[PDB]
Amino acid sequence: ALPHGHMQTLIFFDMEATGLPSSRPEVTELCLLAVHRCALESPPPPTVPPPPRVVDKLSLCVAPGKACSPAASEITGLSTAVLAAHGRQCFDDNLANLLLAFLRRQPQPWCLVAHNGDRYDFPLLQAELAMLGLTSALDGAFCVDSITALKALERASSKSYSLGSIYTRLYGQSPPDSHTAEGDVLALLSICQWRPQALLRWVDAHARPFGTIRPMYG
Amino acid sequence: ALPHGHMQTLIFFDMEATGLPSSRPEVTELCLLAVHRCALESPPPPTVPPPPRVVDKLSLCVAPGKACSPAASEITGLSTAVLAAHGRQCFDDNLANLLLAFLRRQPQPWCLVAHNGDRYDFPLLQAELAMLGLTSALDGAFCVDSITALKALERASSKSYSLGSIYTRLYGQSPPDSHTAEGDVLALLSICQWRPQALLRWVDAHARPFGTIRPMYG
Ligand SMILES: O=C(c1cc(F)cc(F)c1)N(Cc1cccnc1)Cc1cccc(Cl)c1Cl
Ligand SMILES: O=C(c1cc(F)cc(F)c1)N(Cc1cccnc1)Cc1cccc(Cl)c1Cl
Ligand SMILES: [Mg+2]
Ligand SMILES: [Mg+2]
């Protein structure tokens, strides 16, 4: 049984932050890539599938309220000072409104899809919203963690489940860009396009209300 | 003299539409790529410059109120029916609000930069806004047509001024993607990064209020 019916839009989602959850981190970058279910349900001979022609994309850099750790800066190529030099603004009401306006362009139900999203992206997004007193602003959404999905799908078909490990295993080659939120979204999209009908079936069967994600902090 | 001071953000801009201006066309896709002036003023040995690490990007497909022409569909890879199949919504108030929220994340003054923007992108954007009764919604912005800029800059340094012609001339090779609004924005960004300090100087000297752009129709 499908708990919430068929998801109409999959929003591939990735954020960068100042550090890992135990550091009480803040967002430095976010990317949403909204794909209608038809792109996976009814896909139109390369090694890696091309992305769908019709997609919506939002990629934003954000000025966090604290320094990025050296480790974060090495992996993301961002620092708080450099974000500031590019005039980036903090995570504020306008940003929350922009996110909601972007989601409102997508048919519902919406499902956020993020790799280790239950550990990283989903609780951090909830924390940033809570700090604005906008708890529940995005609770119309559903979400799934792609690491859970891809573990289940690999088990059904037949090691590390990092994004890069899965990508290399499936496509016999490393992904293009590992250093930006957009790059991580595009790599995830490619993985999900490997067996797209199976992935979509799994998402529909296991989608969870975003409101069930507790904020990382606050 | 700088008529409006130094532009702080260059928003590389491209739209796709149902047809050329004489057909009274409607938007099918838009892409904004916001780059702080420092990326051009103070750039950090490849053939083509890499894009700046810190950018904001918005790419949206739009359901137009009429069919795309065969010619438009061949060049853009979009059709009205396919946009509809992907659940795309029309150019509406929510979209205008999303655009403004995105621009509000950028330091002012803002300058839209589009290739043949005076013929295509700028008057069409003004027309879509006018149809919503949102004339002047974006008139905080400035704009420049990159074909005018690049003609001036090539003359100062020393044929077709299509995006592809310029790109091939500068980089000795064709651009990656010619079929999406994002692809056209990224190609334009690359051209503008060829002599970035000169391009930025020209933009600052010649930026025009967006309110001086008459709507394409209506
Ligand atoms: O940017 C984040 C991040 C951290 C969060 F808590 C919440 C969030 F939304 C993103 N990273 C974690 C991560 C790891 C794997 C896949 N996706 C993200 C990257 C990262 C890696 C290694 C060391 C560091 Cl210090 C950092 Cl920041
Ligand atoms: O999509 C548009 C377009 C048309 C407009 F009026 C307003 C607008 F914002 C975009 N095209 C014009 C164009 C040409 C060169 C560079 N940039 C855009 C593409 C195009 C080419 C050839 C035949 C057709 Cl029928 C079409 Cl639609
Ligand atoms: Mg991630
Ligand atoms: Mg164009």
Short mmCIF file of C-alpha atoms and ligand atoms in Angstrom, two decimals:
data_model
loop_
_atom_site.label_atom_id
_atom_site.label_comp_id
_atom_site.label_asym_id
_atom_site.label_seq_id
_atom_site.Cartn_x
_atom_site.Cartn_y
_atom_site.Cartn_z
CA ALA A 1 0.00 0.00 0.00
CA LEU A 2 1.15 3.54 -0.76
CA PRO A 3 0.98 5.56 2.50
CA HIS A 4 0.61 8.93 0.76
CA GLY A 5 -0.27 7.99 -2.84
CA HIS A 6 2.10 8.48 -5.78
CA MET A 7 4.69 11.24 -5.49
CA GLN A 8 4.30 13.65 -8.45
CA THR A 9 7.62 15.50 -8.09
CA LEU A 10 10.93 14.16 -6.80
CA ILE A 11 13.06 17.03 -5.53
CA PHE A 12 16.66 15.87 -5.46
CA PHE A 13 18.19 17.83 -2.62
CA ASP A 14 21.64 18.48 -1.24
CA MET A 15 23.13 21.01 1.14
CA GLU A 16 26.64 21.97 2.19
CA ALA A 17 27.26 23.14 5.77
CA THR A 18 29.95 24.51 8.08
CA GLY A 19 30.59 21.09 9.66
CA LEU A 20 29.01 17.76 10.60
CA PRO A 21 25.90 17.51 12.83
CA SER A 22 27.86 17.24 16.10
CA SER A 23 29.25 20.76 15.47
CA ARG A 24 25.75 22.38 15.38
CA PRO A 25 26.40 23.44 11.76
CA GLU A 26 24.76 25.99 9.51
CA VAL A 27 23.94 25.89 5.80
CA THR A 28 26.47 27.28 3.30
CA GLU A 29 24.86 26.02 0.08
CA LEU A 30 21.68 24.32 -1.05
CA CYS A 31 20.50 22.79 -4.31
CA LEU A 32 17.02 21.59 -5.27
CA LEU A 33 16.44 19.79 -8.56
CA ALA A 34 12.75 19.09 -9.19
CA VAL A 35 11.95 16.21 -11.56
CA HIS A 36 8.41 15.17 -12.48
CA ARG A 37 7.74 11.48 -11.85
CA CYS A 38 7.25 10.88 -15.59
CA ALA A 39 11.01 11.33 -16.14
CA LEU A 40 11.59 8.17 -14.06
CA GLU A 41 8.30 6.32 -14.69
CA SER A 42 8.43 6.73 -18.48
CA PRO A 43 12.07 7.54 -19.39
CA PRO A 44 12.59 8.51 -23.10
CA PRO A 45 23.00 4.42 -25.43
CA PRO A 46 25.46 6.27 -23.11
CA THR A 47 27.28 4.99 -20.02
CA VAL A 48 25.53 7.52 -17.76
CA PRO A 49 21.86 8.47 -18.43
CA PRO A 50 21.43 12.13 -19.51
CA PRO A 51 19.42 14.26 -17.04
CA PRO A 52 15.79 14.95 -18.05
CA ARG A 53 15.32 17.94 -20.36
CA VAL A 54 12.51 19.36 -18.23
CA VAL A 55 13.79 20.10 -14.74
CA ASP A 56 13.64 23.00 -12.31
CA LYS A 57 16.85 23.87 -10.46
CA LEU A 58 17.66 26.19 -7.58
CA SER A 59 21.22 26.50 -6.26
CA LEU A 60 21.96 29.12 -3.59
CA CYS A 61 24.96 29.98 -1.44
CA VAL A 62 24.24 31.11 2.10
CA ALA A 63 26.29 33.09 4.61
CA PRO A 64 26.38 30.99 7.82
CA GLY A 65 26.60 32.51 11.29
CA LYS A 66 29.91 30.77 12.06
CA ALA A 67 33.17 29.74 10.43
CA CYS A 68 33.37 26.69 8.22
CA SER A 69 35.78 24.11 9.57
CA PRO A 70 39.00 23.47 7.60
CA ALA A 71 37.60 20.02 6.75
CA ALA A 72 34.36 21.52 5.47
CA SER A 73 36.24 24.08 3.37
CA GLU A 74 38.47 21.38 1.83
CA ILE A 75 35.49 19.26 0.73
CA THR A 76 33.03 22.05 -0.23
CA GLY A 77 35.44 24.75 -1.53
CA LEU A 78 33.52 27.34 0.55
CA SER A 79 34.49 29.45 3.53
CA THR A 80 32.41 31.93 5.53
CA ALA A 81 34.75 34.80 4.59
CA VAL A 82 34.56 33.99 0.87
CA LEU A 83 30.76 33.67 1.02
CA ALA A 84 30.73 37.11 2.65
CA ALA A 85 33.06 38.53 -0.04
CA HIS A 86 30.45 37.44 -2.62
CA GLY A 87 27.73 39.32 -0.72
CA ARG A 88 25.88 36.19 0.39
CA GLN A 89 23.01 36.65 2.84
CA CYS A 90 22.06 34.55 5.84
CA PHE A 91 19.32 31.93 6.07
CA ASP A 92 16.36 34.26 6.54
CA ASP A 93 12.61 34.67 5.95
CA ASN A 94 13.14 35.69 2.32
CA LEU A 95 15.08 32.47 1.70
CA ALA A 96 12.36 30.34 3.30
CA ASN A 97 9.76 32.13 1.15
CA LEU A 98 11.89 31.55 -1.98
CA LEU A 99 12.14 27.83 -1.20
CA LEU A 100 8.36 27.58 -0.70
CA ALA A 101 7.68 29.53 -3.94
CA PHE A 102 9.98 27.14 -5.80
CA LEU A 103 8.21 24.10 -4.33
CA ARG A 104 4.83 25.65 -5.20
CA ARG A 105 5.83 25.43 -8.88
CA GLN A 106 5.92 21.63 -8.55
CA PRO A 107 2.90 19.27 -8.56
CA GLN A 108 2.12 17.67 -5.23
CA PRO A 109 2.82 15.40 -3.55
CA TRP A 110 6.44 16.58 -3.36
CA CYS A 111 9.18 14.21 -2.16
CA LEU A 112 12.63 15.46 -1.16
CA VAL A 113 15.35 12.91 -1.99
CA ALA A 114 18.75 13.29 -0.32
CA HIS A 115 21.70 10.95 0.20
CA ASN A 116 22.07 10.31 3.93
CA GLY A 117 19.32 12.94 4.12
CA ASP A 118 18.11 11.60 7.48
CA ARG A 119 21.53 12.40 8.99
CA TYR A 120 22.45 15.61 7.12
CA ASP A 121 20.09 17.50 4.83
CA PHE A 122 16.65 16.91 6.34
CA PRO A 123 17.39 17.68 10.05
CA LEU A 124 19.55 20.66 9.11
CA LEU A 125 16.81 22.14 6.90
CA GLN A 126 14.34 21.62 9.77
CA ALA A 127 16.74 23.32 12.20
CA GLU A 128 17.23 26.37 9.96
CA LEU A 129 13.45 26.72 9.58
CA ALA A 130 12.91 26.33 13.33
CA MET A 131 15.42 29.13 14.05
CA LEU A 132 13.17 31.41 11.95
CA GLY A 133 10.07 30.30 13.88
CA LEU A 134 8.94 28.60 10.66
CA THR A 135 8.63 25.10 12.09
CA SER A 136 6.23 23.23 9.79
CA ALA A 137 6.71 25.64 6.86
CA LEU A 138 7.74 22.73 4.61
CA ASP A 139 5.64 20.02 6.25
CA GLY A 140 3.45 19.68 3.15
CA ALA A 141 6.46 17.81 1.78
CA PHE A 142 7.48 14.18 1.98
CA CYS A 143 11.03 12.87 2.09
CA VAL A 144 13.14 9.79 1.49
CA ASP A 145 16.78 9.03 2.20
CA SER A 146 18.38 7.65 -0.97
CA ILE A 147 20.94 5.60 0.98
CA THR A 148 18.01 3.59 2.41
CA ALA A 149 16.42 3.33 -1.05
CA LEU A 150 19.60 2.26 -2.83
CA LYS A 151 20.51 -0.32 -0.17
CA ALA A 152 17.05 -1.87 -0.62
CA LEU A 153 17.27 -1.80 -4.42
CA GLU A 154 20.78 -3.30 -4.57
CA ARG A 155 19.58 -6.10 -2.25
CA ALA A 156 16.60 -6.84 -4.54
CA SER A 157 18.93 -6.97 -7.57
CA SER A 158 21.50 -9.32 -6.01
CA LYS A 159 30.44 -2.29 0.70
CA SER A 160 30.32 1.51 0.92
CA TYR A 161 27.07 3.33 0.19
CA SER A 162 28.70 6.74 -0.12
CA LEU A 163 27.46 8.65 -3.17
CA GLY A 164 30.83 8.28 -4.93
CA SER A 165 31.11 4.55 -4.14
CA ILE A 166 27.65 3.80 -5.55
CA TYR A 167 28.26 5.98 -8.61
CA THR A 168 31.57 4.25 -9.40
CA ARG A 169 30.01 0.79 -8.91
CA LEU A 170 27.07 1.53 -11.23
CA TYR A 171 28.82 3.51 -13.97
CA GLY A 172 32.39 2.16 -13.73
CA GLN A 173 33.78 5.69 -13.35
CA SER A 174 33.97 8.55 -10.83
CA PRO A 175 31.31 11.34 -10.86
CA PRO A 176 32.17 14.74 -12.49
CA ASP A 177 31.83 17.18 -9.58
CA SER A 178 32.10 16.22 -5.90
CA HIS A 179 32.63 19.70 -4.47
CA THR A 180 29.25 21.51 -4.92
CA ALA A 181 25.67 20.91 -3.76
CA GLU A 182 24.56 20.92 -7.42
CA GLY A 183 27.24 18.36 -8.27
CA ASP A 184 26.01 16.06 -5.50
CA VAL A 185 22.40 16.47 -6.66
CA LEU A 186 23.31 15.66 -10.27
CA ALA A 187 25.32 12.59 -9.23
CA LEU A 188 22.38 11.37 -7.11
CA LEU A 189 19.98 11.95 -10.01
CA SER A 190 22.23 9.82 -12.24
CA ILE A 191 22.25 6.98 -9.69
CA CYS A 192 18.48 7.15 -9.38
CA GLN A 193 18.17 6.95 -13.18
CA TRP A 194 19.99 3.57 -13.23
CA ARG A 195 16.81 1.60 -12.46
CA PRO A 196 14.35 4.50 -12.45
CA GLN A 197 11.02 2.66 -12.33
CA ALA A 198 12.20 0.55 -9.37
CA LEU A 199 13.55 3.64 -7.56
CA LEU A 200 10.28 5.51 -8.06
CA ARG A 201 8.25 2.50 -6.84
CA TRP A 202 10.39 2.38 -3.71
CA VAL A 203 9.99 6.12 -3.10
CA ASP A 204 6.20 5.86 -3.46
CA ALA A 205 6.07 2.94 -1.02
CA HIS A 206 8.31 4.55 1.62
CA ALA A 207 7.77 8.34 1.45
CA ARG A 208 7.61 9.89 4.93
CA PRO A 209 6.05 13.24 5.99
CA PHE A 210 8.77 15.86 6.35
CA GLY A 211 7.20 16.85 9.69
CA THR A 212 8.45 13.53 11.14
CA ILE A 213 12.04 14.82 10.78
CA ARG A 214 13.19 16.31 14.08
CA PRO A 215 15.38 19.44 13.78
CA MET A 216 19.10 18.80 14.16
CA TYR A 217 19.13 21.35 17.00
CA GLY A 218 16.99 24.07 18.57
CA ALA B 1 31.34 58.56 -15.59
CA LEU B 2 29.34 55.64 -14.21
CA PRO B 3 25.61 56.46 -14.65
CA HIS B 4 24.46 54.20 -11.80
CA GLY B 5 27.69 53.42 -9.91
CA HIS B 6 29.35 50.01 -9.89
CA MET B 7 27.12 46.97 -10.44
CA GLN B 8 27.51 44.57 -7.48
CA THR B 9 25.86 41.50 -9.05
CA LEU B 10 25.81 40.47 -12.70
CA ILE B 11 22.82 38.22 -13.35
CA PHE B 12 23.50 36.27 -16.52
CA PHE B 13 20.06 35.69 -17.98
CA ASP B 14 18.54 33.64 -20.76
CA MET B 15 15.03 32.58 -21.67
CA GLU B 16 13.52 30.17 -24.17
CA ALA B 17 10.15 31.00 -25.76
CA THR B 18 7.47 29.62 -28.08
CA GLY B 19 8.77 31.64 -31.05
CA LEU B 20 10.51 34.85 -32.12
CA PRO B 21 9.20 38.32 -31.13
CA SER B 22 7.03 38.74 -34.26
CA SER B 23 4.94 35.73 -33.12
CA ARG B 24 3.95 37.38 -29.78
CA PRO B 25 5.74 34.54 -27.93
CA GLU B 26 5.56 33.32 -24.35
CA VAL B 27 8.27 32.05 -22.01
CA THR B 28 8.98 28.29 -21.87
CA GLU B 29 12.19 28.39 -19.80
CA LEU B 30 14.27 30.89 -17.88
CA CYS B 31 17.68 30.80 -16.24
CA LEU B 32 19.30 33.34 -13.93
CA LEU B 33 22.92 32.94 -12.83
CA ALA B 34 23.96 35.56 -10.28
CA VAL B 35 27.69 36.31 -10.04
CA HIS B 36 29.17 38.86 -7.63
CA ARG B 37 31.36 41.44 -9.36
CA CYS B 38 34.43 40.15 -7.49
CA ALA B 39 34.40 36.99 -9.64
CA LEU B 40 35.15 39.18 -12.69
CA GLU B 41 37.00 42.08 -11.01
CA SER B 42 39.38 39.85 -9.04
CA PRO B 43 39.35 36.40 -10.74
CA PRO B 44 41.27 33.67 -8.80
CA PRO B 45 45.53 27.07 -17.10
CA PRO B 46 42.52 25.62 -19.01
CA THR B 47 41.19 26.54 -22.47
CA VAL B 48 37.86 27.71 -21.05
CA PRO B 49 37.75 29.51 -17.64
CA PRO B 50 35.93 27.49 -14.93
CA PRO B 51 32.74 29.15 -13.63
CA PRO B 52 33.05 30.87 -10.21
CA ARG B 53 32.58 28.57 -7.23
CA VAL B 54 30.15 30.96 -5.56
CA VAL B 55 27.12 31.49 -7.78
CA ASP B 56 23.36 31.44 -7.38
CA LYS B 57 21.35 29.69 -10.10
CA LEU B 58 17.65 29.48 -10.89
CA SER B 59 16.41 27.48 -13.89
CA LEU B 60 12.65 27.06 -14.37
CA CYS B 61 10.44 25.62 -17.10
CA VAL B 62 7.17 27.40 -17.74
CA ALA B 63 3.94 26.28 -19.39
CA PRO B 64 3.16 28.88 -22.11
CA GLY B 65 -0.37 29.77 -23.18
CA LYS B 66 0.24 28.66 -26.79
CA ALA B 67 2.03 26.01 -28.82
CA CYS B 68 5.75 26.21 -29.44
CA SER B 69 6.55 26.45 -33.12
CA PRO B 70 8.31 23.47 -34.76
CA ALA B 71 11.39 25.69 -35.13
CA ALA B 72 11.32 26.60 -31.44
CA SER B 73 10.94 22.95 -30.43
CA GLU B 74 13.87 21.89 -32.63
CA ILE B 75 16.23 24.46 -31.09
CA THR B 76 15.00 24.36 -27.45
CA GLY B 77 13.93 20.68 -27.13
CA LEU B 78 10.69 21.86 -25.45
CA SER B 79 7.06 21.68 -26.52
CA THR B 80 3.95 22.97 -24.76
CA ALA B 81 2.52 19.45 -24.48
CA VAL B 82 5.72 18.06 -22.94
CA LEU B 83 5.95 20.98 -20.50
CA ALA B 84 2.35 20.18 -19.51
CA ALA B 85 3.18 16.46 -19.10
CA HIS B 86 5.84 17.51 -16.56
CA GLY B 87 3.25 19.51 -14.60
CA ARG B 88 4.73 22.91 -15.45
CA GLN B 89 2.75 25.97 -14.39
CA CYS B 90 2.16 29.20 -16.26
CA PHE B 91 3.92 32.52 -15.79
CA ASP B 92 2.02 33.74 -12.73
CA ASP B 93 2.24 35.89 -9.59
CA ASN B 94 4.06 33.16 -7.67
CA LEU B 95 6.73 33.03 -10.39
CA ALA B 96 7.18 36.80 -10.34
CA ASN B 97 7.50 36.68 -6.54
CA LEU B 98 10.06 33.84 -6.80
CA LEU B 99 12.14 35.87 -9.28
CA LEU B 100 12.07 38.92 -6.98
CA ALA B 101 12.99 36.80 -3.92
CA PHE B 102 15.94 35.37 -5.85
CA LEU B 103 17.10 38.86 -6.89
CA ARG B 104 16.70 40.05 -3.29
CA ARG B 105 19.43 37.56 -2.30
CA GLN B 106 21.88 39.51 -4.48
CA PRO B 107 23.64 42.78 -3.55
CA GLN B 108 22.45 45.82 -5.46
CA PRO B 109 22.85 47.28 -7.94
CA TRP B 110 21.79 44.24 -9.98
CA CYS B 111 22.55 44.07 -13.71
CA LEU B 112 20.87 41.53 -15.99
CA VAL B 113 23.19 40.41 -18.81
CA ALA B 114 21.65 38.68 -21.84
CA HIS B 115 22.86 37.99 -25.37
CA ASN B 116 20.67 39.95 -27.78
CA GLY B 117 18.75 40.72 -24.58
CA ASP B 118 17.36 43.95 -26.06
CA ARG B 119 15.64 41.92 -28.80
CA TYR B 120 14.66 38.75 -26.89
CA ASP B 121 14.99 38.33 -23.13
CA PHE B 122 14.44 41.82 -21.75
CA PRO B 123 11.26 42.84 -23.69
CA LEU B 124 9.75 39.38 -23.22
CA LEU B 125 10.34 39.48 -19.45
CA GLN B 126 8.75 42.95 -19.38
CA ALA B 127 5.77 41.67 -21.39
CA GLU B 128 5.17 38.70 -19.08
CA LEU B 129 5.29 41.01 -16.04
CA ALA B 130 2.93 43.51 -17.70
CA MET B 131 0.38 40.74 -18.38
CA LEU B 132 0.31 40.15 -14.59
CA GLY B 133 -0.18 43.88 -13.92
CA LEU B 134 3.31 43.86 -12.42
CA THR B 135 4.80 46.50 -14.70
CA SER B 136 7.81 47.93 -12.85
CA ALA B 137 8.16 44.92 -10.51
CA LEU B 138 11.77 44.44 -11.63
CA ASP B 139 12.59 48.08 -12.34
CA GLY B 140 15.08 48.21 -9.46
CA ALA B 141 17.30 46.27 -11.87
CA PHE B 142 19.70 47.41 -14.55
CA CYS B 143 20.45 45.59 -17.78
CA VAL B 144 23.00 45.28 -20.56
CA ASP B 145 22.94 43.43 -23.86
CA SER B 146 26.11 41.34 -24.15
CA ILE B 147 26.12 41.51 -27.96
CA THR B 148 26.61 45.30 -27.62
CA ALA B 149 29.28 44.77 -24.95
CA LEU B 150 31.21 42.12 -26.86
CA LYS B 151 31.14 44.10 -30.13
CA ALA B 152 32.64 47.07 -28.27
CA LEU B 153 35.27 44.93 -26.53
CA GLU B 154 36.35 43.09 -29.70
CA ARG B 155 36.72 46.49 -31.42
CA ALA B 156 38.94 47.78 -28.59
CA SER B 157 41.11 44.64 -28.81
CA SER B 158 41.61 44.76 -32.60
CA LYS B 159 31.66 38.46 -38.57
CA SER B 160 28.81 36.82 -36.64
CA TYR B 161 28.12 37.87 -33.06
CA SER B 162 25.88 34.90 -32.30
CA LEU B 163 26.71 33.28 -28.96
CA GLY B 164 28.12 30.18 -30.67
CA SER B 165 30.21 32.20 -33.16
CA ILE B 166 31.83 34.28 -30.42
CA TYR B 167 32.42 31.23 -28.23
CA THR B 168 34.11 29.31 -31.07
CA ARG B 169 36.26 32.34 -31.98
CA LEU B 170 37.45 32.87 -28.40
CA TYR B 171 37.93 29.27 -27.27
CA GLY B 172 38.63 27.52 -30.60
CA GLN B 173 35.81 25.02 -29.95
CA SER B 174 32.01 24.79 -29.86
CA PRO B 175 30.13 25.31 -26.53
CA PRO B 176 28.84 22.22 -24.60
CA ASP B 177 25.07 22.78 -24.53
CA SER B 178 23.15 24.94 -27.01
CA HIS B 179 19.66 23.60 -26.30
CA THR B 180 18.79 24.90 -22.76
CA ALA B 181 18.49 28.32 -21.12
CA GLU B 182 21.09 27.22 -18.54
CA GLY B 183 23.43 26.12 -21.33
CA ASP B 184 23.14 29.53 -22.99
CA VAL B 185 23.77 31.30 -19.67
CA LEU B 186 26.87 29.20 -18.96
CA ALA B 187 28.26 29.79 -22.47
CA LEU B 188 27.70 33.54 -22.05
CA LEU B 189 29.40 33.48 -18.65
CA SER B 190 32.42 31.77 -20.24
CA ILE B 191 32.63 34.43 -22.95
CA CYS B 192 32.39 37.20 -20.36
CA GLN B 193 35.23 35.56 -18.38
CA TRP B 194 37.61 35.88 -21.38
CA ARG B 195 38.55 39.48 -20.53
CA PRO B 196 36.54 39.82 -17.31
CA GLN B 197 37.85 43.14 -15.96
CA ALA B 198 37.23 44.84 -19.32
CA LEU B 199 33.73 43.32 -19.58
CA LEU B 200 32.84 44.47 -16.07
CA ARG B 201 34.17 47.99 -16.78
CA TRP B 202 31.99 48.14 -19.88
CA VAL B 203 28.92 46.93 -17.97
CA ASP B 204 29.46 49.56 -15.26
CA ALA B 205 29.81 52.32 -17.86
CA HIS B 206 26.75 51.30 -19.91
CA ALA B 207 24.20 49.76 -17.50
CA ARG B 208 20.65 50.91 -18.29
CA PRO B 209 17.57 50.94 -15.98
CA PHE B 210 15.39 47.93 -16.74
CA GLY B 211 12.38 50.28 -16.76
CA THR B 212 13.67 51.74 -20.05
CA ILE B 213 12.91 48.39 -21.74
CA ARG B 214 9.50 48.55 -23.40
CA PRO B 215 7.44 45.32 -23.20
CA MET B 216 7.52 43.19 -26.33
CA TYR B 217 3.72 43.40 -26.44
CA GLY B 218 0.74 44.40 -24.30
O1 LIG C 1 28.20 19.68 4.18
C1 LIG C 1 27.92 18.68 4.81
C2 LIG C 1 26.66 18.67 5.62
C3 LIG C 1 26.69 18.48 7.00
C4 LIG C 1 25.50 18.56 7.69
F1 LIG C 1 25.54 18.41 9.04
C5 LIG C 1 24.29 18.80 7.10
C6 LIG C 1 24.31 18.98 5.73
F2 LIG C 1 23.13 19.23 5.10
C7 LIG C 1 25.45 18.92 4.97
N1 LIG C 1 28.69 17.59 4.79
C8 LIG C 1 28.26 16.27 5.27
C9 LIG C 1 27.92 15.33 4.14
C10 LIG C 1 28.57 14.12 3.97
C11 LIG C 1 28.20 13.27 2.94
C12 LIG C 1 27.19 13.68 2.10
N2 LIG C 1 26.54 14.84 2.23
C13 LIG C 1 26.92 15.63 3.24
C14 LIG C 1 30.00 17.65 4.14
C15 LIG C 1 31.17 17.32 5.05
C16 LIG C 1 31.84 16.11 4.87
C17 LIG C 1 32.93 15.78 5.64
C18 LIG C 1 33.37 16.64 6.62
C19 LIG C 1 32.72 17.84 6.81
CL1 LIG C 1 33.26 18.87 8.07
C20 LIG C 1 31.62 18.19 6.04
CL2 LIG C 1 30.82 19.71 6.28
O1 LIG C 2 13.70 31.19 -27.41
C1 LIG C 2 13.96 32.20 -28.04
C2 LIG C 2 13.44 33.52 -27.55
C3 LIG C 2 12.60 34.30 -28.34
C4 LIG C 2 12.09 35.45 -27.80
F1 LIG C 2 11.24 36.19 -28.57
C5 LIG C 2 12.36 35.89 -26.53
C6 LIG C 2 13.20 35.09 -25.79
F2 LIG C 2 13.50 35.48 -24.52
C7 LIG C 2 13.75 33.92 -26.26
N1 LIG C 2 14.73 32.18 -29.13
C8 LIG C 2 15.34 33.36 -29.74
C9 LIG C 2 16.81 33.48 -29.44
C10 LIG C 2 17.77 33.53 -30.43
C11 LIG C 2 19.11 33.66 -30.10
C12 LIG C 2 19.44 33.75 -28.76
N2 LIG C 2 18.55 33.72 -27.78
C13 LIG C 2 17.26 33.58 -28.13
C14 LIG C 2 15.11 30.89 -29.71
C15 LIG C 2 14.68 30.68 -31.14
C16 LIG C 2 15.64 30.70 -32.15
C17 LIG C 2 15.30 30.48 -33.47
C18 LIG C 2 13.99 30.25 -33.82
C19 LIG C 2 13.02 30.23 -32.83
CL1 LIG C 2 11.39 30.00 -33.30
C20 LIG C 2 13.35 30.45 -31.50
CL2 LIG C 2 12.13 30.40 -30.28
MG MG C 3 25.11 15.61 0.75
MG MG C 4 19.08 33.59 -25.65
#
